[PDB]
Amino acid sequence: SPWFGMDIGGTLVKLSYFEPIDITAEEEQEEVESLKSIRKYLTSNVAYGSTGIRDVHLELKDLTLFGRRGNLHFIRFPTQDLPTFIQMGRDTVLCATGGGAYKFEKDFRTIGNLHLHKLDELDCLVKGLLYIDSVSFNGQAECYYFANASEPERCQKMPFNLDDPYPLLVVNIGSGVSILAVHSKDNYKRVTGTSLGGGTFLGLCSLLTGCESFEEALEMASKGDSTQADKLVRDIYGGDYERFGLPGWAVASSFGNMIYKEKRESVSKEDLARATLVTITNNIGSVARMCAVNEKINRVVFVGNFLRVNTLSMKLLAYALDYWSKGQLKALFLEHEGYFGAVGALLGLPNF
Amino acid sequence: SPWFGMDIGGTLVKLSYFEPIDITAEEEQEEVESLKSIRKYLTSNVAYGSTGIRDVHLELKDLTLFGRRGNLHFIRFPTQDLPTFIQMGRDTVLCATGGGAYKFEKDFRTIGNLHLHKLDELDCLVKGLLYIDSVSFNGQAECYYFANASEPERCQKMPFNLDDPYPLLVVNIGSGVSILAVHSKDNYKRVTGTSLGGGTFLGLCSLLTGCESFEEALEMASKGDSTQADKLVRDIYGGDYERFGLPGWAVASSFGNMIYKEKRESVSKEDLARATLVTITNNIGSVARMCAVNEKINRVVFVGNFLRVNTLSMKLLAYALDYWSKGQLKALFLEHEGYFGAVGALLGLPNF
Ligand SMILES: Nc1ncnc2c1ncn2[C@@H]1O[C@H](COP(=O)(O)OP(=O)(O)NP(=O)(O)O)[C@@H](O)[C@H]1O
Ligand SMILES: Nc1ncnc2c1ncn2[C@@H]1O[C@H](COP(=O)(O)OP(=O)(O)NP(=O)(O)O)[C@@H](O)[C@H]1O
Ligand SMILES: CN(c1ccc(CC(=O)N2CCN(c3ccc(Cl)nn3)CC2)cc1)S(C)(=O)=O
Ligand SMILES: CN(c1ccc(CC(=O)N2CCN(c3ccc(Cl)nn3)CC2)cc1)S(C)(=O)=O
Ligand SMILES: [Cl-]
Ligand SMILES: [Cl-]
Ligand SMILES: [Mg+2]
Ligand SMILES: [Mg+2]
């Protein structure tokens, strides 16, 4: 059967697919047509139907996995369209994680003789993250940070070595936020979580601006000025609050200028989009900082698809974590941010 | 001059006024008419103009302060109307705190010969809180909690003794949130803060529902169902997430169901109001819990006017802090929640 790892989240399904490239002459003959059809369909298309996408830039080439050489592919589609995916399946051992492995268990079993193996989200995320960093991103670093994140004339993406990764705080920003403390390959825990995550950004932004996609929400936010909606320290003090080291530019009250009707009447949708992004991102950074201090961990890695094609939030996290921690914490990012659970699921295949 | 303490916040001005009740015959003769006019105006009205209110139920009667006996009064009005207040003044030693003591310093100085003494917000809040608890609320406890906050057939307001208050975590919910760690009467610090506070509730609620007052926003929220807007753990898993002790009813993504257009089209304004209240309140409780754990403090007292006439948020904090801390933390509340800075300012009068 094809080797697939699936993470069924609240919003997106992530799929990792290993395409063998060492198929011999005899193996090709023994391949049933449906298998050949699956492999050709997946490798010859980059859009699947109307909502599935293969992230070609993320592909790991010439990976050795389970004693075969192949390419590792990364594919995503909305959980809302999982019925289409299962219907296509009905017309294999599936290692699956995420809440949807439980919620849609009975649906996957409508595919005759399919064995569904539910795997723990935590084990899968940690195993997948550690594995991808270990094999590298086609020889480049999987992990990066923003150097000199305080100075914008100097701020630039730079590689970060995770060869001895422990300890590590992992902040998984999906629909909500889960925060993990990773002490070893076999010693890790979920510290806490918050419900102010990527789904809050997308849901509030949709209500406030009428945007109809994540990418559209980000494009709006790139054009906005969040200070039209937010109340800053200088709006309350007239300047800095020196006594507690609060700069005048710090947000004192997110959306706090929207208590005034005349300000609600002048704010643009782009301003509201940017205020929503800033509010959610700063809250994530602050919760990450508090957990890092409590866990006595100084490396904080952010994963999940809230940060996909979202450089504004990445740079805000890099700057905020450095600034508010007085340089004690470092924000770290990974190229395969949304896919670690799906990879970790795929890596459980030998257990079955 | 009249004895007044003022806390000029980003949203509300809070004023504490000591009315002497031991005025002798000779003292009454020596009283200038404007002073007599001020005292009669303040004690014979409960609404001042169109936006000022005296909170009569909070009055401390027959207090001994600075060697005089009198009544302590508590008065509030919107900071937006401070120009009216100053204009009425122009037609005294003023101890003032809050960001507006700095921002409006020059405005207060337009009152001839007025001496304005700016006092630190932190000193004022801690001093005022400790003082009011020490004198009691007319013989009743100033501090209370919700007993058996998990069981609604039993949950009830009960008094809490703060005779040895230290250590104490003070969570001040105003436009934003400030969190203080109080170790002694002279040893306290601002731990951190968040910008998701009362101004976020009021501003977002106004944008989402068109409400035009704090009280209207609360009335809407009392009628709503936040689960129409929020995505819960059971929406993602089909039930509880036992592995990490997350109940199915826990919010996984605030406003996370609003990523679906059909759900945005069916949600009511009351539902959005309640989701905004729940989102802000849960985030405050979670940040309070993380700070309490880091500070090794198990008593968490919530102050500020976000909780004024807001029993929903108080009960949510009481329940959430107890539940998520496995009973290790206790949420505490104070009858004079919005006024401690103004009292602490008034208490600085002998220094000048
Ligand atoms: N194409 C997209 N569609 C929807 N959301 C997107 C998309 N791209 C990025 N996002 C963001 O990514 C978030 C989902 O991140 P993801 O890590 O896939 O979470 P999830 O696994 O589906 N949810 P969870 O159940 O909470 O673990 C959304 O909340 C958006 O903020
Ligand atoms: N009558 C009211 N008008 C406005 N807001 C109210 C009112 N009553 C309660 N509130 C809530 O109380 C919050 C203001 O609390 P308050 O403690 O007075 O803060 P502030 O001191 O004015 N702001 P800050 O500068 O942040 O310390 C608002 O954000 C509302 O959520
Ligand atoms: C989808 N997932 C998830 C993500 C985020 C959440 C939210 C969370 O974790 N909460 C626990 C801590 N909370 C509070 C609230 C009040 C207080 Cl006083 N204290 N804590 C908030 C709710 C729950 C599931 S998942 C499977 O983990 O990836
Ligand atoms: C009005 N007041 C106030 C209230 C609240 C605030 C907000 C705050 O304190 N912040 C400091 C901590 N922040 C972050 C952000 C990202 C990260 Cl990574 N870390 N921390 C958020 C901003 C500031 C003033 S006041 C005078 O105190 O009562
Ligand atoms: Cl299983
Ligand atoms: Cl001064
Ligand atoms: Mg996920
Ligand atoms: Mg205040």
Chain position carrying tokens 């809040």: B125
In terms of domains, do A2 and A116 share one?
yes
Cis peptide before B152 (omega within 30 of 0): no
Rounded Cα distance between A292 and A169, Å, is 7
Q: Which ligand is nearest to the CA of A197?
A: 1
Q: Which two tokens stand for residue A275?
A: 């205020």
Rounded Cα distance between A79 and A100, Å, is 8
Q: Are strands B231-232 and B143-147 parallel, antiparallel or unpaired?
A: unpaired
Q: Which two tokens stand for residue B233?
A: 């753990």
In terms of domains, do B154 and B168 share one?
yes
Q: How many CB pairs lie under 8 A apart between chains A and B?
A: 207
- From B210, B241, B267, the end of a domain falls on B267
Distances (CA, A) of B50 to A19, B47, B78, B84: 73, 7, 10, 11
Rounded Cα distance between B39 and B202, Å, is 34
Instruction: Answer yes or no: are the C-beta atoms of B197 and B12 closer than 8 Å.
Output: no
The SS3 call for residue B321 is: helix
Instruction: Answer yes or no: are the C-beta atoms of A118 and A105 closer than 8 Å.
Output: yes
With the C-alpha atoms ordered B246, B248, B249, B252, is the resulting torsion angle positive or negative?
positive
Q: Is A329 in the pocket of ligand 4 (CB under 6 A)?
A: no
Q: Is A44 annotated as contributing to ligand binding?
A: no
The active-site residue out of A121, A270, A295, A337 is A121
Please judge whether B204 and A258 are an interchain contact, meaning their C-beta atoms are less than 8 angstroms apart. yes
Nearest CA, atom 6, ligand 4: A252
Select from A43, A214, A72, A188 the least CA-distant residue to A125.
A188
Instruction: Answer yes or no: are the C-beta atoms of B7 and B341 closer than 8 Å.
Output: yes
In terms of domains, do B26 and B153 share one?
no
Chain position carrying tokens 């108080």: B314
Q: Is A16 annotated as contributing to ligand binding?
A: no
Please judge whether B244 and A195 are an interchain contact, meaning their C-beta atoms are less than 8 angstroms apart. no
Residues, beta carbon < 5 Å, ion ligand 5: A 117-118
Instruction: Answer yes or no: are the C-beta atoms of B8 and B119 closer than 8 Å.
Output: no
Angle at B174 between CA B170 and CA B178, to 5 degrees: 40
Q: Which ligand is nearest to the CA of A199?
A: 1
Rounded Cα distance between A267 and A262, Å, is 9
Residues, beta carbon < 5 Å, ion ligand 6: B 117-118
Ligand 1 pocket, residues with Cβ under 6 angstroms:
A 9-12, 98-99, 174-176, 198-199, 201-202, 214, 304-306, 308, 338; B 236, 252
Helix residue ranges per DSSP H, B82-182? 82-89, 99-103, 105-108, 121-135
Helix residue ranges per DSSP H, chain B? 25-29, 33-44, 82-89, 99-103, 105-108, 121-135, 198-209, 214-223, 233-237, 261-266, 269-295, 311-324, 340-347
Please judge whether A199 and B231 are an interchain contact, meaning their C-beta atoms are less than 8 angstroms apart. yes
The SS3 call for residue B282 is: helix
Dihedrals phi, psi of A264, to nearest 5 degrees: -60, -30
In terms of domains, do A197 and A253 share one?
no
- State CA A281 to chain mean position distance: 13
Q: Say how many Å lie between the CA of residue B191 and the centre of ligand 2.
A: 21
Q: Is B33 a catalytic residue?
A: no
Please judge whether A207 and B103 are an interchain contact, meaning their C-beta atoms are less than 8 angstroms apart. no
With the C-alpha atoms ordered B287, B291, B294, B297, is the resulting torsion angle positive or negative?
negative
Angle at A12 between CA A6 and CA A14, to 5 degrees: 30
* H or E segment and range at residue B3: strand B3-8
Rounded Cα distance between A332 and A171, Å, is 10
Q: Which two tokens stand for residue A211?
A: 């945007």
Q: Is A86 in the pocket of ligand 4 (CB under 6 A)?
A: no
Instruction: Answer yes or no: are the C-beta atoms of A190 and A177 closer than 8 Å.
Output: no
Looking at this protein, which amino acid is placed at residue A321? L
- State CA B224 to chain mean position distance: 24
Rounded Cα distance between B10 and A259, Å, is 11
| Packed helices B214-223 and B311-324: angle between N→C axes, nearest 10 degrees | 60
Q: What is the CA radius of gyration of chain A?
A: 22
In terms of domains, do A250 and A109 share one?
no
In terms of domains, do B176 and B317 share one?
yes
Please judge whether A286 and B230 are an interchain contact, meaning their C-beta atoms are less than 8 angstroms apart. no
Q: Say how many Å lie between the CA of residue B115 and the centre of ligand 6.
A: 8
Instruction: Answer yes or no: are the C-beta atoms of B201 and B277 closer than 8 Å.
Output: yes
Q: Say how many Å lie between the CA of residue A119 and the centre of ligand 7.
A: 13
Rounded Cα distance between A254 and A232, Å, is 8
In terms of domains, do A247 and A350 share one?
no
Rounded Cα distance between B204 and B218, Å, is 13
Looking at this protein, which amino acid is placed at residue A30? E
Rounded Cα distance between B4 and B27, Å, is 19
In terms of domains, do A32 and A81 share one?
yes
Q: Is B175 in the pocket of ligand 2 (CB under 6 A)?
A: yes
Q: Is A235 in the pocket of ligand 4 (CB under 6 A)?
A: no
Select from A277, A179, A281 the least CA-distant residue to A223.
A277
Cis peptide before B20 (omega within 30 of 0): no
Dihedrals phi, psi of A115, to nearest 5 degrees: -100, 120
Instruction: Answer yes or no: are the C-beta atoms of B137 and B336 closer than 8 Å.
Output: yes
Instruction: Answer yes or no: are the C-beta atoms of A298 and A326 closer than 8 Å.
Output: no
* H or E segment and range at residue B78: strand B68-78
Please judge whether B236 and A99 are an interchain contact, meaning their C-beta atoms are less than 8 angstroms apart. yes
Q: Is A190 annotated as contributing to ligand binding?
A: yes
Instruction: Answer yes or no: are the C-beta atoms of B96 and B116 closer than 8 Å.
Output: yes
Query: Which of A259, A269, A306 is the best residue to mutate to test the B interface, defined by the most B CB atoms within 10 Å of its own CB?
Result: A259
Q: Say how many Å lie between the CA of residue A244 and the centre of ligand 7.
A: 37
In terms of domains, do A113 and A147 share one?
no
With the C-alpha atoms ordered B196, B202, B203, B206, is the resulting torsion angle positive or negative?
positive
Nearest CB to A207 within list B120, B175, B208: B208
Distances (CA, A) of B197 to A226, A245, A273, B172, B277: 17, 20, 19, 9, 10
- From B237, B267, B297, the end of a domain falls on B267
Chain position carrying tokens 């406030």: A208
Rounded Cα distance between B264 and A204, Å, is 10
Rounded Cα distance between B96 and B114, Å, is 12
How many CB atoms neighbour CB B269 within 10 A? 16
Task: For residue B97, list its beta bridge partners.
Answer: B7
Give the number of domains in chain A.
3
Select from B322, B334, B324 the least CA-distant residue to B157.
B334
Burial tier of B117 (Cβ tally within 10 Å: 0-12, 13-18, 19+): middle
In terms of domains, do B112 and B135 share one?
yes
Resolution to one decimal, Å:
1.8
Residues, beta carbon < 5 Å, ion ligand 7: A 9, 174
Q: What is the largest CA-CA distance in chain A?
A: 78
Non-local (6+) Cβ contacts of A147 within 8 A are A154, A155, A156, A157, A158
Dihedrals phi, psi of A242, to nearest 5 degrees: -65, -40
CB burial of A101-124 (b: ≥16 within 10 Å; e: otherwise) equals bbbbeebbeeeeeeebebbbbbbb
- From B267, B292, B322, the end of a domain falls on B267
Closest chain B residue to A295 measured between Cα atoms?
A: B294
**Shortest Cα distance from B204 to chain A (angstroms)?**
6
**Shortest Cα distance from B178 to chain A (angstroms)?**
9
Rounded Cα distance between A239 and A233, Å, is 7
DSSP 8-state assignment for residue B59: P
Q: Is B2 in the pocket of ligand 2 (CB under 6 A)?
A: no
Please judge whether A259 and B99 are an interchain contact, meaning their C-beta atoms are less than 8 angstroms apart. no
Q: Which two tokens stand for residue A283?
A: 């809250």
Select from B253, B303, B304, B309 the least CA-distant residue to B278.
B253
The structure was resolved experimentally with X-ray
Chain position carrying tokens 């404007």: B34
* Numbers of helices and strands, H then E, in chain B: 13, 17
Rounded Cα distance between A172 and A198, Å, is 10
Per-residue three-class SS string for chain A = CCEEEEEECCCEEEEEEEEECCCCHHHHHCCCHHHHHHHHHHHHCCEECCCEEECHHHCEEEEEECCEEEEEEEEEEEHHHHHHHHHHHCCCEEEEECHHHHHCHHHHCCCCCCEEEECCHHHHHHHHHHHHHHHCECCECCEEEEECCCCCCCCEEEECCCCCCCCEEEEEECCCEEEEEEEECCEEEEEEEECCCHHHHHHHHHHHHCCCCHHHHHHHHHHCCHHHCCEEHHHHHCCCEHHHCECCCCEEECCHHHHCHHHHHHCCHHHHHHHHHHHHHHHHHHHHHHHHHHHCCCEEEEECHHHCCCHHHHHHHHHHHHHHCCCCCEEEEECCCCCHHHHHHHHCHHHC
Rounded Cα distance between A100 and A11, Å, is 10
Using a CB-CB distance cutoff of 8 angstroms, which residues of chain A are in contact with residue B103? 236-238
Residue-range definition of the domain harbouring residue B166: 141-224+268-338
Rounded Cα distance between A323 and A320, Å, is 5
Angle at B64 between CA B7 and CA B119, to 5 degrees: 25
In terms of domains, do B177 and B255 share one?
no
Q: Which two tokens stand for residue A273?
A: 């989009």
Q: Say how many Å lie between the CA of residue A177 and the centre of ligand 3.
A: 7
Instruction: Answer yes or no: are the C-beta atoms of A284 and A194 closer than 8 Å.
Output: yes
In terms of domains, do A158 and A291 share one?
yes
Using a CB-CB distance cutoff of 8 angstroms, which residues of chain B are in contact with residue A80? 260
Task: For residue A170, list its beta bridge partners.
Answer: A180, A301
